[PDB]
Amino acid sequence: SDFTQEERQFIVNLWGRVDVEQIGAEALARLLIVYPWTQRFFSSFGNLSSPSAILHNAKVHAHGKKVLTSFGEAVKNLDQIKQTFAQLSELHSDKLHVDPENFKLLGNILIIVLAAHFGKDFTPASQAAWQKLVSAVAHALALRYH
Amino acid sequence: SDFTQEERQFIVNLWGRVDVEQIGAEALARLLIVYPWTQRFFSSFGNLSSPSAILHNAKVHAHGKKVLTSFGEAVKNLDQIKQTFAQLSELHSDKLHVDPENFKLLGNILIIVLAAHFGKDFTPASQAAWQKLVSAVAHALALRYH
Amino acid sequence: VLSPGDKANVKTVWSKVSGHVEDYGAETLERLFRVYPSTKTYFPHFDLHHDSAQIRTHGKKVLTAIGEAVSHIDDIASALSKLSDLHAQTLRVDPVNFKLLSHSFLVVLAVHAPSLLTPEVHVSLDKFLVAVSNVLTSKYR
Amino acid sequence: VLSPGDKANVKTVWSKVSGHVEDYGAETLERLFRVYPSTKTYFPHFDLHHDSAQIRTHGKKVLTAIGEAVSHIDDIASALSKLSDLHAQTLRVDPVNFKLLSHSFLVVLAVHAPSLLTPEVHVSLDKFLVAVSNVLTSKYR
């Protein structure tokens, strides 16, 4: 068993009230200023010279929404996450050689961004269910073989 | 094939001219001041409050020689290193929960300590053969299962 | 390196944490233990019932320890030389956990003071929290 | 943080490196490539024949780049803001390699100036080499 019905509830319900645009863009922009070296992977996204520039960069906004939409694929099928991020794994690994621990940094910002947005509703238990999900995602995006 | 006869030569011959006492004690004392946090694992070894104190600590000297004698077990049988450090692996892992990357820090100091001692004889190729050996050791000292 | 910018950003956040050191400290440990069950193994002798007495009391100890580092921000080491040996030499706590705790705390701040935890501010106290962890884990600088 | 002690220790070592920037730089890359074959993949267009012309010439470029950081030791970033974007954004060199190079160099120093590479000195330039790598890999400090 990957998740429990209790966790599934925390994931699905919380995900239902999530605005992919705002949260996704917030998570990406925050990842790039808090952990500046992740910028290297984003060479074609224009201006990333300052926190303010990142926050107003439109390519960052757009890509941030696509990331959060991707997190939506995991939610739709929690027990098959691995197979879902199969394509994205080879892209993030084989093609775009990304350090595996970066998927973890990005899961940490998303959780913090979710906490800032949902406040007290983002209880310890709800957070626990989301750590498993973001953790499950980061893992699946790092393939060693096949 | 783990090593090549050429590497075997570099390992065995160089090892023959090695004083376990001096080199072993030098490697351990250097590990503890260059990477101070490795000291935590050595709580019963007395005074480690200063570089000078470490260099003159007798428990460090003694244990440094036992470490280098251990590296001698790898040399005696290069193709069976893993089976040799079987006991030491569980000790360094299961018992003394040591960060795996520390065995690598210790292999880096030993190579530097060997270079300082053997000078120009410690050619790039000789160093290459020793990196494989120290690398092989560090690896074998980190068991995940069984 | 903690720039004057980080320093002040740290002080502003701590002005909103002061007067809640027990509540926030208690919630910090709660998320840590609930979100990362493995961190509980360091507390076999605690009545770890989600929100018990020892959780809130220990929580206050930790968050108060943080506040000290905020006071002596310029020389965090010295103002923690005691806890360092505890966590480093005696307890020998796995360094990863410090990041999980530092993380658990930022999540508490996001909940109670989201607008304040701006990205530049987030960057600051996360540089400060890493400065604190390195000390409690011992590092040659 | 680089203490005045580290600073001077770095300068003393570099006084013995100066006047050999090409020889030591050439031997630094040689050990790197010979001891860690994977680092060669970054140089497809080089005549990597153990000790060729491009190895010694590139070696001098690297060791000279180091010397600059020794001159501007107080503000290493600025004196490398150019190479940082190169290695970080353009080349996107895996950060590990910087440690392999920093290591390859210490091994060269051990060979030619062992008595000088004392443990306290070893600690210093290894703190300096990490200061250099972080810059060439980009970090918020």
Ligand code: HEM
């Ligand atoms: C673990 C959470 C992550 C998810 C769910 C995710 C999702 C995605 C998606 C959906 C795309 C494709 C967008 C497109 O079609 O162009 C993508 C591409 C990309 N990702 Fe991620 N990603 C994650 C983490 C990361 C991390 C940690 C990095 C590096 C620090 C990264 C760097 C990139 C880059 C550079 C691209 C290509 C950009 C482009 O198309 O111009 N991603 N990712």
Ligand code: HEM
């Ligand atoms: C990879 C190279 C290493 C080798 C060949 C090696 C070898 C040994 C040997 C032979 C012993 C047993 C001595 C005895 O009987 O008491 C030992 C124990 C020990 N090792 Fe290592 N070791 C290595 C790396 C490390 C590292 C990286 C650490 C931690 C930073 C470490 C920490 C310890 C400690 C704390 C003990 C027990 C000390 C005691 O008996 O009082 N070792 N090791």
Ligand code: HEM
């Ligand atoms: C910001 C990081 C941390 C701070 C400021 C902090 C602070 C403290 C303080 C003030 C004490 C009380 C010491 C005394 O009474 O003398 C303590 C004890 C302790 N800490 Fe931490 N700590 C931190 C991180 C951690 C982590 C990550 C763990 C591991 C999961 C941990 C495990 C423990 C344990 C097992 C004790 C002893 C508790 C007892 O027996 O009452 N600490 N800490």
Ligand code: HEM
């Ligand atoms: C102390 C660390 C390093 C320093 C000081 C350094 C310095 C330099 C310098 C000065 C250049 C010449 C740039 C120019 O002409 O504009 C260069 C280029 C380059 N570096 Fe590094 N470097 C370091 C580490 C590394 C590492 C670890 C690698 C990866 C294995 C690497 C890969 C390259 C490549 C592929 C080039 C371009 C070479 C060419 O096309 O001629 N560098 N570096």
